[PDB]
Amino acid sequence: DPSDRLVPELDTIVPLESTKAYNMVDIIHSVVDEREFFEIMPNYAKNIIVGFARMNGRTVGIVGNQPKVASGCLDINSSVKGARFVRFCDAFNIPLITFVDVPGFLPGTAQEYGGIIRHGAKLLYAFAEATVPKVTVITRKAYGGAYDVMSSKHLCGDTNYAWPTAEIAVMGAAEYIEKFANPFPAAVRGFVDDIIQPSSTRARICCDLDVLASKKVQRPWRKHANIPL
Amino acid sequence: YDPNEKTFDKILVANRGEIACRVIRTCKKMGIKTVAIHSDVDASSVHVKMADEAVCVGPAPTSKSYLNMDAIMEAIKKTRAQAVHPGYGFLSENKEFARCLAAEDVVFIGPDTHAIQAMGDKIESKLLAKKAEVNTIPGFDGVVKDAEEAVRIAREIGYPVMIKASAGGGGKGMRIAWDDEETRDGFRLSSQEAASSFGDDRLLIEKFIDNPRHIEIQVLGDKHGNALWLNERECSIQRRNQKVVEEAPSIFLDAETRRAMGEQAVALARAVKYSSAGTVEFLVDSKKNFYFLEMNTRLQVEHPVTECITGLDLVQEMIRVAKGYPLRHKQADIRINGWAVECRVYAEDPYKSFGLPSIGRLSQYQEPLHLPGVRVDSGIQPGSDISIYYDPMISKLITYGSDRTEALKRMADALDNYVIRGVTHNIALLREVIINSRFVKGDISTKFLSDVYPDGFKGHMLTKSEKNQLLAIASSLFVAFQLRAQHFQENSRMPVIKPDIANWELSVKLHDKVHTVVASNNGSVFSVEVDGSKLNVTSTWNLASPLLSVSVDGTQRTVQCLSREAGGNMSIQFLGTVYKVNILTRLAAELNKFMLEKVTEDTSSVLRSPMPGVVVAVSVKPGDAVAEGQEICVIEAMKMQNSMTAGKTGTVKSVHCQAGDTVGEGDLLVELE
Amino acid sequence: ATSVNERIENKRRTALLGGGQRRIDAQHKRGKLTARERISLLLDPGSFVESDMFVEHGDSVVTGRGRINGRLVYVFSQDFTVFGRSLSGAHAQKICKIMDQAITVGAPVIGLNDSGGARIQEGVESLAGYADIFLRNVTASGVIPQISLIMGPCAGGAVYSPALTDFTFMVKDTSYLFITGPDVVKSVTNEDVTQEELGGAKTHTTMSGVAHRAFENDVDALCNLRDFFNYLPLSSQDPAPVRECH
Ligand SMILES: Nc1ncnc2c1ncn2[C@@H]1O[C@H](COP(=O)(O)OP(=O)(O)OP(=O)(O)O)[C@@H](O)[C@H]1O
Ligand SMILES: *C(=O)CCCC[C@@H]1SC[C@@H]2NC(=O)N[C@@H]21
Ligand SMILES: [Mg+2]
């Protein structure tokens, strides 16, 4: 499987209407080697997707939002499911690839009483702690603190890319919408490295995984950290 | 393609799909600016991309986008298009469109409104043909109002009776009848369905012809009275009265009959004052007696094959005729060059009623453009989706050769090298048809699919040698995957000790039988022992490419590995048909013998709503048989709408969640079996 | 002849005492103190040393260092009550720099969160600032102790910073912790709930398990915070504190 293979089928996979959803597993299958994906917890917390795949023959971990289920919103179960997988991938030098289409956290008194703050902070910590190479692609949406948790603004994401249909809005929704109906406000402030065509996605990621294989960072000494569990 | 001959400057193609792409291509070859009309869902289609400029015309439904005549006229006015090309279908047969275009300022690339009106109605066409001294299908002239008139006129014409609905078409509103009670009941129900759908309610009685051969003649005429016949075409392999396989030179016909049919078609075209490209269709019996049947006043879908054997670009000639130039070819210039065969690759399931429309999005699409003597006409690209609004036709595949055998061989090779992943297609049916013994011999009729597969399409019934080759290929692929699984990079801390296995003993389950296979690897060559039969399989064993070319005992075979699981399941497209094979090791099979079979009735007979939300509308109607994976209704929650499928496989008895029903999570939605 | 000398004094008096007495009185009638009053109560008398007194005229946050019972600590206190419109980049930059200094020297961080006055109402660099704060909280986890005292309503991604800290304390009847407001809950979930029910101190100290303790008011909370801080070591490089015993 050549690392420079184009994926034109991803050029129109994201619908123009934000009210209409799509399947992130299709994108994951299109990007990875031989379209082979080992999904972890496929039938639990279906609003998030985690699994193992290969890029250029190297094992990679995949985390992504699923707009089909609960509009891709994050909650307690998806938070912990993604967090432990990210921690395992970081603990064994496995690079992470993230696909971001999260509109925020699931509201309601059940989530608040269940401790949505702690469980969300678990995913925040898991992404902010990883020292492995990490590549992030924003497909359509990234709102609120959900934008920050899914590897955005320097606590996670060595390279960040946005599709032409991607957009970041702190409070989504005439003159103001046109300004923030595009990732240009993100690009001008250096939020994302570039705006790429979907067809090049795989190739880009492969190139990045070659450069970041020798990434080393230094952190202050500690016996261990305090997980927000 | 001489550019010195001045032609129109701007042409607007009022169509979509592959015909729009073909028209845009032939206009680009002629140095003409092109305007493409499109709907919202087609804003990223291929013909929009290859056009000079594009205009959005309306929403997804065809009644509001490709039939909204006011919108097309507004687009023409705002783009100042000199000419308009309707392709086939849509508004190509609408008198009002041509009348308005000729009224305002627009020239219409097609037949005049007089010819379209003359040949629009079947009764008028038949009477005009009878007045045009051409052989016609024998029957009673006039409109039948009651079934008793039908039976009395069926007394003398013959026992085989056909009930036909005037005008319209598309293989609908037409039926057969044998008995007199059959005559009444068929006439009554045909009148009912014509009132329901057609609305004309005009029915006619015809003498059915057994084992008919559908032969078309492509006529081309200018406005100066010249008329030419461009050989013939054979379109006999049909289901639902719709053609799938077409053949340019008629093997059944000879020179004299072809010349007579061409002369009759030219005479009919002159009588109707045709001034464009059209086709006249005939039914030929066993004794070579052709009878007229319908005239298409537009470009046929299967026109490329007669282009291949004649070397003429039909759309270019149509444009030149519409400009006013005379025909640049004489009847003696027309000649037969080689042989041509075309198949219609549809997005349909051939195992159900010889084709049932299917929907989906194309994850992978690769045409065999690098093969010798192959031409593909498609408006389809990777990522395109097959919606319900338009025809589920993926592509048209044409192959040409020096003779019939070379063309058929090249067509089989092209069909075996055609990658379509995302929807279900009918490539298996086409490949089965083109390699059939009867099709090769040439004794075919319109009931070919009816009698070759009386119980329906079942697949490719593979022989013993083919079964051995398939088993050897599957075993070799399994062993190649296992061997690739052992190729890690050097660790330098814990070196990998590669196992030195020499023989792989495998149990391969195919259909319902179990075979014992012994595989050995010698570099790039696999020696395979299947039930005592020895075969050699060689290939590059590239496990990532969609197409794999292998050589089994010197025979070259192209196979596709559609799916593969760690449990041993594997789907292989071989000779055009998809086979499921389960491959295990001998120890694995022996231990699997102890596994208990689990009944797969599943749970949750009542479907549970995944999220609470109201239903804007219901796509399907209660009483329709559906299965799991087919969308039923659209439920909106958190300002996002999901068109979820049926929870359990069963017919939709009743949609409990109608419009305005705010159904909660985990609740009954649709009564299913 | 330059008026810089009087301009500096005017800016100092504007930062320390605010533009006017209006909203400080308004805070007083709600039973809450100001950021500077809270800092003065928390730290030893005369030990506070402020940093970045002059950043885009304000900042709705007061950061600095001080001593508790003679031991060094770094503190920040939010002052969003009619003192800042949006939680701008200056806010997060000051918090990040004070946390960086605390990590550099090896001293704990205490944060008083009272982002009530103006929540955001506009900001794109705001999420960036909280992303930086989250990164520095995760970096300091297990290196220096981190204490959060919520003394007012906190909403949005901000609430994730106290969650990453080691200990979280709340003030009864005046502090709230919730990702999404009650009005959005009504709009989406279609249920009636108040701020106290959704994210009050009792909810987060009895049901959700988010906060660790609750206190009666600001003075009691700060006294108990000093008492609790007496227990902890300054860094993970230090042994457990040993006091004299009787
Ligand atoms: N009189 C007949 N005897 C036998 N078969 C017939 C007769 N009339 C029609 N058929 C069958 O019906 C098929 C289609 O006929 P016809 O061209 O009239 O239909 P249509 O739906 O109007 O066509 P189109 O879509 O090309 O306009 C023929 O190919 C043939 O198989
Ligand atoms: C609908 O009434 C508008 C509010 C929903 C906003 C969406 S859904 C929940 C997520 N949380 C948030 O702040 N935005 C997202
Ligand atoms: Mg016809």
- The Cα-based distances of B133 to A171, B116, B211, B259 in angstroms read 77, 20, 25, 16
Are residues B667 and B534 part of one domain? no
- The Cα-based distances of C228 to A128, A203, C221 in angstroms read 29, 54, 10
Spatial distance between the Cα atoms of C134 and C157, rounded to a whole number of angstroms: 10
Contact status of A156 with chain B (Cβ, < 8 Å): no
Q: Which atom of ligand 2 is nearest to the CA of A71?
A: 8
Which ranges of C30-144 does DSSP label H, i.e. alpha helix? 35-42, 89-105, 125-140
Q: Is C184 in the pocket of ligand 2 (CB under 6 A)?
A: yes
Give the tokens for residue C192: 């009636």
Are residues B474 and B389 part of one domain? no
Spatial distance between the Cα atoms of A136 and A150, rounded to a whole number of angstroms: 8
Contacts of C212 in chain A (CB under 8 A): none
> Which C-chain residues 165-224 have CB contacts (< 8 A) with chain A?
166, 177-180, 184-185, 188-189, 191, 193, 197-199, 203, 207-210
Confirm whether residue B24 is marked as ligand binding: no
Among all residues of chain C, which has the CA nearest to that of A150? C131
Give me the DSSP letters along C147-209: EEEE-SEEEGGGGHHHHHSSEEEEETTT-EEESS-HHHHHHHT-----HHHHH-HHHHHHTS-
CA distance B41 to chain A (A): 10
Give the dihedral of Cα atoms B204, B209, B213, B214; nearest 10 deg: 0
Q: Which residues pair with B243 in a beta bridge?
A: B238
Note whether B372 and B400 are within 8 A (CB): no
Token match 């005439």: residue? Answer: A174
3-state SS assignment for residue B482:
helix
Spatial distance between the Cα atoms of B86 and B92, rounded to a whole number of angstroms: 5
Spatial distance between the Cα atoms of B419 and B546, rounded to a whole number of angstroms: 7
Are residues B213 and B201 part of one domain? no
Token match 């509001």: residue? Answer: B64
Are residues B605 and B576 part of one domain? no
Half-sphere exposure of C159 (CA within 13 A, CB side): 29
Spatial distance between the Cα atoms of B528 and C105, rounded to a whole number of angstroms: 72
Spatial distance between the Cα atoms of C180 and C198, rounded to a whole number of angstroms: 9
By the 10 Å C-beta count (0-12 exposed, 13-18 middle, 19+ buried), B575 is classed as: buried
Nearest alpha carbon to residue B345 among B423, B233, B232, B251: B423
Confirm whether residue B229 is marked as ligand binding: no
Nearest alpha carbon to residue B327 among B284, B269, B287, B367: B269
Note whether B527 and B534 are within 8 A (CB): yes
Q: Is A18 in the pocket of ligand 2 (CB under 6 A)?
A: no
By the 10 Å C-beta count (0-12 exposed, 13-18 middle, 19+ buried), C197 is classed as: middle
Are residues B144 and B46 part of one domain? no
Sheet with B174-177: strands ordered across: B174-177, B161-165, B203-207
> Which A-chain residues 27-66 have CB contacts (< 8 A) with chain B?
29-30, 33-34
Give the tokens for residue C144: 């220096």
Give the tokens for residue A128: 């902010």
Contact status of C236 with chain A (Cβ, < 8 Å): yes
Query: Are β-strands B374-377 and B393-401 bridged in parallel, bridged antiparallel, or unpaired?
Result: antiparallel
Query: Are β-strands C49-51 and A194-195 bridged in parallel, bridged antiparallel, or unpaired?
Result: unpaired
Spatial distance between the Cα atoms of C197 and B465, rounded to a whole number of angstroms: 76
Are residues B359 and B297 part of one domain? yes
Confirm whether residue B597 is marked as ligand binding: no
Residue B40's CB is within 10 A of a number of other CB atoms, namely 12
What's the structural domain count of chain B?
5
Domain stop point among B431, B446, B461: B446
Contacting subunits of C (3+ beta carbon pairs below 8 A) = A
Give the contacts of B543 (CB within 8 A, at least 6 positions apart): A34, B477, B480, B481, B484, B561
Amino acid in position B428 = A
Give the tokens for residue C187: 């709009």
Spatial distance between the Cα atoms of B525 and B534, rounded to a whole number of angstroms: 13
Query: Cβ of A20 and B641 within 8 Å?
Result: yes
Note whether C48 and C83 are within 8 A (CB): no
- Indicate the length of chain C as a whole number: 246
Catalytic residue among B294, B406, B466, B631: B294
Domain extent, residue B165, equals: 137-208
- Ligand 3 centroid to Cα of residue B433, in Å, is 21
Q: Which atom of ligand 1 is nearest to the CA of B446?
A: 31
Are residues B169 and B111 part of one domain? no
Give me the DSSP letters along B493-550: SS--------EEEEEEEETTEEEEEEEEEETTEEEEEETTEEEEEE----SSSS-EEE
Spatial distance between the Cα atoms of C229 and C165, rounded to a whole number of angstroms: 14
What is the residue with the minimal CA distance to atom 13 of ligand 2?
A: A104
Contact status of C33 with chain A (Cβ, < 8 Å): no
Q: Which of C122, C166, C180, C187 to mutate to test the interface with A (most CBs of A within 10 A)?
A: C180
- Ligand 3 centroid to Cα of residue B218, in Å, is 13
Are residues B252 and B307 part of one domain? yes
CA distance A51 to chain C (A): 25
Contact status of C126 with chain A (Cβ, < 8 Å): yes
By the 10 Å C-beta count (0-12 exposed, 13-18 middle, 19+ buried), A179 is classed as: exposed
- Ligand 2 centroid to Cα of residue B196, in Å, is 48
Amino acid in position B197 = S
Residues B92-128 as b/e (b if ≥16 CB within 10 A, e otherwise) read bbeeebbebbeeeebebbbbbbebbebbbbbbebbeb
Spatial distance between the Cα atoms of B218 and B128, rounded to a whole number of angstroms: 19
| R_g of chain B computed on alpha carbons | 29
Residue B637's CB is within 10 A of a number of other CB atoms, namely 18
- Ligand 3 centroid to Cα of residue B294, in Å, is 6
Q: Is A144 in the pocket of ligand 2 (CB under 6 A)?
A: yes
What is the residue with the minimal CA distance to atom 7 of ligand 1?
A: B208
Spatial distance between the Cα atoms of C191 and B375, rounded to a whole number of angstroms: 63
| R_g of chain A computed on alpha carbons | 17
Note whether C41 and C62 are within 8 A (CB): no
A44 backbone φψ class: left, alpha, beta (φ>0; ψ -120 to 50): beta
Give the contacts of B417 (CB within 8 A, at least 6 positions apart): B368, B371, B547, B558
Token match 């309306």: residue? Answer: B58
By the 10 Å C-beta count (0-12 exposed, 13-18 middle, 19+ buried), B2 is classed as: exposed
Are residues B241 and B364 part of one domain? yes
Query: Cβ of C123 and A170 within 8 Å?
Result: yes
> Which runs of E-coded beta strand occur in chain C?
49-51, 61-68, 71-78, 109-113, 146-150, 153-155, 167-171, 176-178, 213-215
Give me the DSSP letters along A19-69: TB---HHHHHHHHSGGG--EEESTTSSTTEEEEEEEETTEEEEEEEE-TTT
Q: Is B599 in the pocket of ligand 2 (CB under 6 A)?
A: no
Spatial distance between the Cα atoms of A89 and A56, rounded to a whole number of angstroms: 18
DSSP 8-state class, residue C117:
S
Note whether B358 and B349 are within 8 A (CB): yes
Give the tokens for residue B194: 């014509």
Token match 């002849």: residue? Answer: C1
Query: Cβ of C164 and A154 within 8 Å?
Result: no
Are residues B65 and B41 part of one domain? yes
CA distance C56 to chain A (A): 20
Q: Which residues pair with B615 in a beta bridge?
A: B635
Note whether A145 and A107 are within 8 A (CB): no
3-state SS assignment for residue C243:
coil
* Residues in chain C followed by a break, C to N above 2.5 angstroms: 57
CA C150 to chain centre: 7
Token match 């001008």: residue? Answer: A188
Spatial distance between the Cα atoms of B546 and B572, rounded to a whole number of angstroms: 11
Q: Which ligand is nearest to the CA of B293?
A: 1
Give the tokens for residue A51: 């699994």
Q: Is B214 in the pocket of ligand 1 (CB under 6 A)?
A: yes
Spatial distance between the Cα atoms of B414 and B425, rounded to a whole number of angstroms: 15
Element (H, E) at B586: helix B586-592
Residue B266's CB is within 10 A of a number of other CB atoms, namely 21
Q: Crossing angle, helix C218-229 and helix C35-42, to 10 degrees?
A: 40
- Phi first, then psi, for residue A86 (nearest 5°) are -65, -40
Domain stop point among B411, B427, B446: B446
CB pairs under 8 A between A and B: 45
**Which of A105, A140, A141, A148 to probe ligand 2 with, by most ligand atoms within 8 A of CB?**
A105
Among all residues of chain A, which has the CA nearest to that of C157? A145
Spatial distance between the Cα atoms of C141 and C166, rounded to a whole number of angstroms: 8
Query: How many degrees, rounded to 5, is the angle at CA A13 between CA A8 and CA A19?
Result: 160
Spatial distance between the Cα atoms of B532 and B18, rounded to a whole number of angstroms: 50
Spatial distance between the Cα atoms of B304 and C143, rounded to a whole number of angstroms: 76
Nearest alpha carbon to residue C86 among C130, C118, C124: C118
For residue B234, indicate whether it is catalytic. Answer: no
Domain stop point among B573, B595, B617: B595
Token match 């969300």: residue? Answer: A120
- The Cα-based distances of B96 to B41, B92, B564 in angstroms read 27, 10, 55
Spatial distance between the Cα atoms of B228 and B274, rounded to a whole number of angstroms: 11
Spatial distance between the Cα atoms of B63 and B56, rounded to a whole number of angstroms: 14
Are residues B441 and B387 part of one domain? yes
Spatial distance between the Cα atoms of B496 and C50, rounded to a whole number of angstroms: 61
| R_g of chain C computed on alpha carbons | 18
Note whether B638 and C188 are within 8 A (CB): yes
Which ranges of B142-245 does DSSP label H, i.e. alpha helix? 147-157, 180-193
Are residues B551 and B525 part of one domain? yes
What is the residue with the minimal CA distance to atom 1 of ligand 1?
A: B208
Contacts of C236 in chain A (CB under 8 A): 222-223
Query: Cβ of C179 and A114 within 8 Å?
Result: no
Spatial distance between the Cα atoms of B15 and B12, rounded to a whole number of angstroms: 9
CA distance C155 to chain A (A): 11
Give the tokens for residue C215: 């206190």
